[PDB]
Curated annotation (Swiss-Prot), chain B:
DNA-dependent RNA polymerase (RNAP) catalyzes the transcription of DNA into RNA using the four ribonucleoside triphosphates as substrates. Resistance to the antibiotics salinamide A, salinamide B, rifampicin, streptolydigin, CBR703, myxopyronin, and lipiarmycin can result from mutations in this protein. This is DNA-directed RNA polymerase subunit beta. The RNAP catalytic core consists of 2 alpha, 1 beta, 1 beta' and 1 omega subunit. When a sigma factor is associated with the core the holoenzyme is formed, which can initiate transcription. The rRNA transcription and antitermination complex (rrnTAC) consists of RNAP, NusA, NusB, NusE (rpsJ), NusG, SubB, ribosomal protein S4, DNA and precursor rRNA; S4 is more flexible than other subunits. In pull-down experiments interacts with CedA. (Microbial infection) Interacts (via flap domain) with Escherichia phage lambda antitermination protein Q; this interaction renders bacterial RNAP resistant to transcription pausing and allows it to read through termination signals. Acetylated on several lysine residues in the presence of glucose. Belongs to the RNA polymerase beta chain family. It comes from Escherichia coli (strain K12).
Swiss-Prot record, chain C:
Zn(2+) 2 binds at C800, C874, C881, C884. This is DNA-directed RNA polymerase subunit beta'. The gene is rpoC. SUPFAM superfamilies: beta and beta-prime subunits of DNA dependent RNA-polymerase. Its cofactor is Mg(2+); Zn(2+). It is an enzyme of class 2 (transferase). It holds the Pfam family RNA_pol_Rpb1_1.
UniProtKB/Swiss-Prot annotation, chain E:
Its EC number is 2.7.7.6. GO terms for molecular function: bacterial-type RNA polymerase core enzyme binding; DNA binding; DNA-directed RNA polymerase activity. SMART domains: RNA_pol_Rpb6 (SM01409). This is DNA-directed RNA polymerase subunit omega. GO terms for biological process: bacterial-type flagellum assembly; bacterial-type flagellum-dependent cell motility; cell motility; cellular response to cell envelope stress; DNA-templated transcription initiation; intracellular iron ion homeostasis; nitrate assimilation; protein-containing complex assembly. Pfam families: RNA_pol_Rpb6 (PF01192). The RNAP catalytic core consists of 2 alpha, 1 beta, 1 beta' and 1 omega subunit. When a sigma factor is associated with the core the holoenzyme is formed, which can initiate transcription. The rRNA transcription and antitermination complex (rrnTAC) consists of RNAP, NusA, NusB, NusE (rpsJ), NusG, SubB, ribosomal protein S4, DNA and precursor rRNA; S4 is more flexible than other subunits.
From Swiss-Prot, chain F:
Belongs to the sigma-70 factor family. RpoS subfamily. The chain holds residues 53 to 329 of 330 of the full protein. One of its GO terms (biological process) is regulation of DNA-templated transcription initiation. Changing K121E: Eliminates RpoS proteolysis. Lack of interaction with RssB. This is RNA polymerase sigma factor RpoS. A motif (Interaction with polymerase core subunit RpoC) lies at residues 66-69. Induction: Subject to complex regulation at multiple levels (transcription, translation, regulation of activity and degradation). Transcription is induced during entry into stationary phase and in response to different stresses. Transcription is repressed by antitoxin MqsA. mRNA stability is regulated by small RNA regulators and various proteins such as Hfq, CsdA, CspC and CspE. Finally, the cellular level of RpoS is regulated by proteolysis via RssB and the ClpXP protease. The sigma-70 factor domain-2 mediates sequence-specific interaction with the -10 element in promoter DNA, and plays an important role in melting the double-stranded DNA and the formation of the transcription bubble. The sigma-70 factor domain-2 mediates interaction with the RNA polymerase subunits RpoB and RpoC. The sigma-70 factor domain-4 contains a helix-turn-helix (H-T-H) motif that mediates interaction with the -35 element in promoter DNA. The domain also mediates interaction with the RNA polymerase subunit RpoA.
Amino acid sequence: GQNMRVAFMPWNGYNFEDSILVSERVVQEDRFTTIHIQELACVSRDTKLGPEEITADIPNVGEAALSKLDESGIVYIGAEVTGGDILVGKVTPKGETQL
Amino acid sequence: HARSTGSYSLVTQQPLGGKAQFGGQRFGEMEVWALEAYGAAYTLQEMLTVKSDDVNGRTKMYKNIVDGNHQMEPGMPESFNVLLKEIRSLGINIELEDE
Amino acid sequence: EEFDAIKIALASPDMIRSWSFGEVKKPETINYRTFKPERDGLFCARIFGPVKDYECLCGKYKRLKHRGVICEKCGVEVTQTKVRRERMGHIELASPTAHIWFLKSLPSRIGLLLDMPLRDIERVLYFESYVVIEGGMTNLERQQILTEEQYLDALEEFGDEFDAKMGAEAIQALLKSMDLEQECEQLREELNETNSETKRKKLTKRIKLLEAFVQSGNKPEWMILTVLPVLPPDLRPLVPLDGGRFATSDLNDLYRRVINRNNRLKRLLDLAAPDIIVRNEKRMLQEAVDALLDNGRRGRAITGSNKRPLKSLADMIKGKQGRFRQNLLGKRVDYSGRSVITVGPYLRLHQCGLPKKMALELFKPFIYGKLELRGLATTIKAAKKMVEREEAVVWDILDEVIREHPVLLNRAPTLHRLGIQAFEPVLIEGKAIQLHPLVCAAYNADFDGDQMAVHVPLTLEAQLEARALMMSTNNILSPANGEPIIVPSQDVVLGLYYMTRDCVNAKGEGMVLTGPKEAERLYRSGLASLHARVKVRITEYEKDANGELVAKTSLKDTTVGRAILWMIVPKGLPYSIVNQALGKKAISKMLNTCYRILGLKPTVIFADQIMYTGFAYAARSGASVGIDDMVIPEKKHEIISEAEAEVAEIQEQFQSGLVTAGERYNKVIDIWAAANDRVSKAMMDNLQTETVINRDGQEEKQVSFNSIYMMADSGARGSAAQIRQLAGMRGLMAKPDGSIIETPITANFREGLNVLQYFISTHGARKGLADTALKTANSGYLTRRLVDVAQDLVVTEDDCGTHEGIMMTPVIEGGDVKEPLRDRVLGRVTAEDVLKPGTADILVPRNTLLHEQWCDLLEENSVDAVKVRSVVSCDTDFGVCAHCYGRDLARGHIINKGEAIGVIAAQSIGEPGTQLTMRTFHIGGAASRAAAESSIQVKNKGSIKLSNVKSVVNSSGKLVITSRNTELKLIDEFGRTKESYKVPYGAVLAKGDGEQVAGGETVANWDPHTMPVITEVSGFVRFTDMIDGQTITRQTDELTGLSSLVVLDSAERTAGGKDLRPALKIVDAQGNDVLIPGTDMPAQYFLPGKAIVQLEDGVQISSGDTLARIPQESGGTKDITGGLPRVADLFEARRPKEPAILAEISGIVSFGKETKGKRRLVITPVDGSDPYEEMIPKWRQLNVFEGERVERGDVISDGPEAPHDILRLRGVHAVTRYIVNEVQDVYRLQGVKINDKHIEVIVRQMLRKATIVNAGSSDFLEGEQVEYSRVKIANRELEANGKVGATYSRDLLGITKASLATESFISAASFQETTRVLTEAAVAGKRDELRGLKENVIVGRLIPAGTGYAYHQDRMRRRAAG
Amino acid sequence: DIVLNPLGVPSRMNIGQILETHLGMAAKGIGDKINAMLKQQQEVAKLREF
Amino acid sequence: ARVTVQDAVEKIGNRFDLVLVAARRARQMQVGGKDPLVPEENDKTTVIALREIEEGLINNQILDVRERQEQQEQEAAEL
Amino acid sequence: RVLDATQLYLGEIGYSPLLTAEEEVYFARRALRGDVASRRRMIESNLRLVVKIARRYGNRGLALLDLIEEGNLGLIRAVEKFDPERGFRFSTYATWWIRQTIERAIMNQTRTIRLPIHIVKELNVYLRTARELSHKLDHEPSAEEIAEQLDKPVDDVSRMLRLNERITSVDTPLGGDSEKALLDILADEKENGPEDTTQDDDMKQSIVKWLFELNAKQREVLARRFGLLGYEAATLEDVGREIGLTRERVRQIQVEGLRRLREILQTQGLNIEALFL
DNA sequence: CACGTATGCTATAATGTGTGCAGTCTGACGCGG
DNA sequence: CCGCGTCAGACTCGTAGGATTATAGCATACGTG
RNA sequence: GAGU
Ligand SMILES: [Mg+2]
Ligand SMILES: [Zn+2]
Ligand SMILES: [Zn+2]
């Protein structure tokens, strides 16, 4: 962890039941800031109808979305992503449906 | 984590659990008794029916909420139906004698 | 859709066929390639319906264009796929099979009905032996088992005319042919011959079975299955996982076994196979069916490759994982979220911080609806995409919707109702929920990582329920005790303490200030301290006789701090309330006072205000914790050195072989306990009042201005016990067993413990921590049982119109009025006035709620005891009236009809246990009891008044007590009771009865460690049944020759000395017995186990000499782990191990005969002249001495009272008060306030049922047990119609059995014991009309209580008028 | 940098945190003295003595 | 009204029936678009109903009266 | 007493006397003739053989009792097809039938999803081949390595190995902890969403409103032909026959009504375009 | 006819199982000898 | 009585997916495009 | 593993 300058005193109930009041300075210096490496997988399986494809050719996709995806349909190294962004494009053979 | 409406469980029909599966919280027996103590009848019934199994009730309630009218249209939880069927599979005749 | 009731009855083979829509003849689930259901298989779509909505299998018929069409090609009906979960199938079994539930689940049912032992049935079933179904030749009777060779003998001899068969067929046939009517009459005729006690029970059981069997319309044939039902596909799903894998229910595997075995049996029959193979297959079939229904019941559960037993049908209904508990009494719920919680000091009481992101999701549909009214969103899909993009206009809309909309915050475990409270959400940027400080108490929420759940009340009704019933502002008071639960804590208390507390002169002593505004100005200018003593002009509003307020200006003497707090104080309240130094305990009273005078709204505002100023001043103070505050006492080393030498003295006495190991262990504990107290006292005195260094005039003194002491004295945090371990002494640690270690921890925390002190600490610490994790389950289980049994109790009526009620007296345990008559009776309805001419002329009329007003008048008048209307004594059937309950403690006024009181009661009783099981479980590592029960020192002057005492004057001239129920009172001038104390057996008194005593005078003195056995007569000691090795042992020493006689118990005794009772017989010089004064009782005192004897046989004694000393190891730990099992033993109505004996009926006591010491009693009343006899064990000594006028339920023996016997002899008020007091003893010892009325609720539920002894005009008759409500309603109709009246007697039931005894089998089954409950109900043909709350919640209906009471009574009037 | 509530000490009986804080402050005090001396650049000798 | 419901409870009495009464009134405003007595002052339907009850305008029995009055006039119109 | 199925059955078989060769031949001559008693005695005398063989084949297929019954069925086939005249012993002949029947039973019943014999036996040769490969490669073999050995398609090998994927129970609790099973996580994918159900209401109802905007004639033609407000999707001839003879005119009014809806959409389609996700 | 699924037969003698784990918990409440 | 059996044993949260084996070889038989 |  990280050592720091602490004072023991109440403060307007912001440290009520063990609660902690911390200075913006600690956040600015990013010393408690942490790194997390998460792992997302796209599987292309073979179904009864036929194989799933990992193409960039997907129904209903914006150019904005496909910009960060290469020809294969895979996001580029270095790319910043946010919830909802497509990482690996994949498509599945859909059967009949009574419209 | 938070959820309004999402996937539901297979046989019991009540919402699934856990944040990774986009689940609802459990309102357990303990939690039910709280509401009973207070006497909050509709809130209770709400959590038993429109918020959980009651299939036609949940959809009807959702439509009503989007149309403003906060009307309760409650029915019977599907898990109860299941229970009867499980008892009949046991070879015990358990019938509802209606009014 | 909506039904009235639910019936369970036996499933006929024919009935099973009715539900079925196809016979499943194949194990094939689906095809390997086209994963479509296989023909006549377990998932057959021809049987159970179409896989896809309005599509046949082969795809010939598609859409609604073909509605009810049945495809000729494939054979599938074209409908909703929905039906696959609804439609059942069936299997035709070649050989009949027993239903395991109606076989193995006891009572046997099938065995009970045939009166055939279970083993016997089984030998028949598994084809070990034949059974005779009808031996026409009376030579061979019915149901008589024959072995294989036994069947061969009578085969040639009788043959033909006797039919005896083997297996399920035989038993089914035997069942079919039994005529229940006839045999019922036959058995009833035999019941009249000589009905022995146990015989009459078993016979009455079969009688009730046969009666109920005919009433149900069930037939015994149906116990045997020929048709086996098949559960719908979707309730045993076969689904493909994403990865191409398949996952199925275990039921499908079990069914595949059954089908395979049954179909092989059909094959073996077609092939006409030899009978041994037919037998094996029939057993095989039964095995598979039994596994299907209930796997690990009969024998080895059939296991998967994982080793784990397959989950059968019954496992899905049974236990926690079962449908009831898991998916029906509790559910996963939409519009719910959860997060980490943190403080919101800035929040007002009715608010909470709700993360924007969370609220955006929770209120999704309301946002869409509003978006369409604004015309911002064209369609629902567009609104969805608009909220995904999280547009700035959507934030404003969300803000619009959340206004005035309550959300529910919940924290687990939800012990009482306040664990869920409603708030107005305040949207905040950031992911944690912010909780208001004052309600932290109710949630038990501390922010060390706690999390909370959020729920959205959706409907206008639910929103209103939340705002009105569940809002934090509205629910202040604990429903358990009438105390405000929202009480400032921690920093808030600390700050208020800091402002109100006074210091010597300080800045600006004796200033004169205009109003508290001038005070605030001066303080913040820095010309006065908060603790400066000062004169201040305050205008205090005193509320008049009516609502009008009268104000009055006064110059008071207070600090600057107190004046400033007066600004937060509302007008109406007095200044003297704040004029004292404030702490947590005073602030709770403050809030209460404000609630009672002003009301809700003022108190709510005042509470917030107090919170703000509390924290505010807390911070300013600059209060901190450094190593120097932990002041040590110079007399620390000194005290310890002395204590060690004192312990060493007893250790040297032990090596000498004089003092025992137990005696030394006790004395060492007492030395260290006394030293620990003195060191604590020295630390507190050296820290409490150390501020001698004053000023102003000259050297004055004041209270210590420490940071620690202040924290503890204010009640913010810490206590004297804690500071002992910081500065003083750690104390005596306790082992995980409960016993205390001989060496305590002498050191403390500031000084630092060594390796061994630390190690020694660990044991006790860990024991405590484990107790948190492990014992809370048992606490919580208690909560659950209570709740289940009180469920049904609701306020049904306003006034029952009863005159009945319990007479509450005063309690004075030790000295302080633990439960003054005022605190015990407040907010109860007075059943009956008490006219004592008096000082304030008080009648207080009937049916008056005791307001604080009338209670204060009672104190002035000195009321002794009062009849108060009670839940138990209510006449309302199917609930209680508002009057018999009284105040809803959580509201502070009379309870509203409709309120579900039972649930409240059980929660309130259960919670503390459950919470205290976690608390003193980690807040302390150490044990602190008090073995100071040495003597009794009176506090105030008065005259001594002994009641129920029986002592005898000794040689030393001391009134030695020989009574067990001895008690000492302290009567004042007017003849009023005040102080009392339990004086034990063999205690030495100071002064006789009545004698006067001054203050601080020792009137009693005894030795706790040891229960001496003092005599009554003088003479010589004679040994009877005191053989060495048989009952006693021999223990001597060296030189002269001393020896100690110890009494072994059956535990350490021999088969020979088992019936031998050791005693010390008293004789004179001539060798003749000495009778007890004024009786024909030879003085013979029976020694119990482990009894020690110093002086051996042949020794002269005088009246008052101790014969023996019974050692007494009570490790009383204690805390709660010990208490709650006592409480549970009470609520479950378990009879104590050695119960006292009571007189049954009033009359004159007559002693009779003795069987080798076993006492018979030939008792003869006055009116009922016929004698009544009762056998008593030999060693059990009676406290009374015969020949007496005895009321019903006078205590003969020493021992604990069984609640059953109390009810049976002294009626309901007696047992009710016994349980209430005995329970309250536990909780009182742990400092838990619970109102008696809650325990009274439970008691009443326990007294639901009554056994009828003598026939009525109905079909009650002898020995049936029915609900007391129903039989009293019957008696109202009997009164009207005359006819034969029904004589009954009320019975007490433990909580578990009382819940199982309710007429509702859904409630019973859902509770526990589900397999048995269901067999019972199915056979009885029982119907539940759904009265209780449990029942309704299971079916997802509207509760019959609270909000729902209105709707439910409307439905009920619809039911009554057709 | 952080303000902790002192009311979470006496109940808890974890005094290690307080000792840690005092020693911590002394540790940092010496650090600041060394830091001050390094900024001034007194000399190797003087740093070594201290 | 808004925070604390105490004076509203004092008017009606039974908390539970207060909830029913206010819900029925709020449903009228929500669905029927029935006219509020007290100025909304930008408050929600639920709050409007509770204010009305506090001041003693709405009552279970009064609601029943206006229900029959208007229903009877509707039947008169039909005939 | 002694309530094990197995023990009881084994005791019963024990109490039948073992046959010699000459006895078997005499009995069996009469058994083929149809002696009944002879057949019964030969079966019962040779049950012990069945149990010895089922003991071997058990292991992991099925319950011992299950194997014993199937084995008995094989033994019965053997008694029906025995040749007494041929010098070969009965036990030798029966062993073949008993092993055969047990194996065939365990090829069918063992698998939850019933696998045809051909597929099963194919799969088994893939397995045995894999074993030889693994011994010599040191490594367990890939799908394509097994395929190269058989000189066959990799798709064939892959499909077979997919079928060998053995089942997981939905009820099996997850994570070595008796907390919650697969069922507790597993969604119903088909069942949308009060969202989705309410969206269909909204959709269907918006279409009603849109249909009424059009002419009475167009709306009725559309309703009857689509099967929207009508019951059945009435063909051109049906709609024309009920209204206006001209079958061609139904097509004309229908297509006209669609184009008027396009106009409403270009004007007020601002709501309709958002139905595209 | 072919393709997918099934039913079938094979002849030295061999003729009563075991096998893989369970680990022992606890205070209470009934049920045949 | 003794002994053997059955029944209960807090509430929410979490993490992560996953295991095993083997059934011969060939000729005729039944159902679908 | 997180509060009880
Ligand atoms: Mg906590
Ligand atoms: Zn079809
Ligand atoms: Zn009453």
